[PDB]
Write a protein that binds this ligand. Structure first.
Ligand SMILES: *[C@@H]1O[C@H](CO)[C@@H](O[C@@H]2O[C@H](CO)[C@@H](O[C@@H]3O[C@H](CO[C@H]4O[C@H](CO)[C@@H](O)[C@H](O)[C@@H]4O)[C@@H](O)[C@H](O[C@H]4O[C@H](CO)[C@@H](O)[C@H](O)[C@@H]4O)[C@@H]3O)[C@H](O)[C@H]2NC(C)=O)[C@H](O)[C@H]1NC(C)=O
Ligand SMILES: *[C@@H]1O[C@H](CO)[C@@H](O)[C@H](O)[C@H]1NC(C)=O
Ligand SMILES: *[C@@H]1O[C@H](CO)[C@@H](O)[C@H](O)[C@H]1NC(C)=O
Lengths: 50, 50
């Protein structure tokens, strides 16, 4: 999927990974030590899988 | 040899006329193949492919 749409799904920050989840319908893949920082200061987000 | 022409060899060496043989090879095996999904469906790659 990502090789097809490699301009729109791929942001360039961890910040734009946060914002486009909060606004769009988007399932950003972050490193797990930053998800534990985001999902404890922004309680409307979560960590889906293992 | 001739400065205008070059080497006009008499390359025939008929003391032993039969010299070498070659090898039949790859031939690339042209496969007649129509497109049907999910079998031979096209790629969504964003460039021309060869
Ligand atoms: C004596 O008389 C001759 C002819 O009357 C005059 O011309 C010289 O002799 C021949 C005929 O023109 C020339 O030989 C050719 O030279 C080519 C060299 O390629 C280039 O070399 C440099 C760059 O490195 C350039 O400055 C030059 O202008 C050339 O463009 C060869 O590649 C030629 O091709 C063929 O050579 C032999 C067959 O002969 C084979 O290997 C191949 O088939 C190849 O395709 C050709 O050999 C020669 O260059 C002419 N000039 C000179 C200065 O020698 C002479 O001027 C004249 N006087 C003297 C002093 O020789
Ligand atoms: C999550 O986002 C909504 C708007 O999308 C906002 O109203 C809400 O306050 C946010 N949650 C927290 C805990 O701030
Ligand atoms: C080389 O010599 C042979 C013998 O007659 C003949 O093919 C011709 O004269 C020469 N070849 C070429 C290509 O000039």
């Amino acid at each position: 999927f990502m090789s097809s749409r490699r301009q729109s799904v791929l942001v360039k920050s961890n910040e734009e990974g946060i914002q486009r989840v909060l606004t769009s319908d988007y399932a950003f893949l972050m490193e797990s030590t930053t998800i534990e920082f985001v999902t404890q200061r922004n309680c409307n987000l979560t960590q889906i899988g293992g | 040899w001739d400065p205008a022409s070059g080497l006009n060899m008499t390359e025939s060496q008929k003391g032993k006329p039969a010299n070498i043989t070659d090898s039949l090879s790859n031939r690339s095996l042209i496969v007649t193949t129509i497109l049907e999904e999910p079998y031979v469906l096209f790629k969504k790659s964003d460039k021309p492919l060869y």
